[PDB]
Homo-oligomer: A and B are copies of this chain.
């Protein structure tokens, strides 16, 4: 799904394959993905 969808103190790495500048998107928000913010992993808690 083009919509990435984050719990509150969660964050995911977006693979900007225009630059592969993988950057943490500190949540939470309804971040929207073009294929320039490609998500890598899951909403796993990361205690």
Contacts and interface: CB of A to CB of B under 8 A. Distances in A.
A39 to B, nearest CB: 13
Please report whether the interface of chain A is mostly helix, strand, loop or mixed according to DSSP.
loop
The interface size bin for chain A is under 10
13 contacts: A2-B35, A18-B32, A18-B34, A32-B35, A33-B34, A33-B35, A34-B34, A34-B35, A34-B36, A34-B37, A35-B35, A35-B36, A36-B36
Interface string A24-37: 00000000111111
Nearest to A16: B34
A33 B33 CA distance: 12
Given A32-B35, A34-B34, 6 more contacts: A2-B35, A18-B34, A34-B35, A34-B36, A34-B37, A36-B36
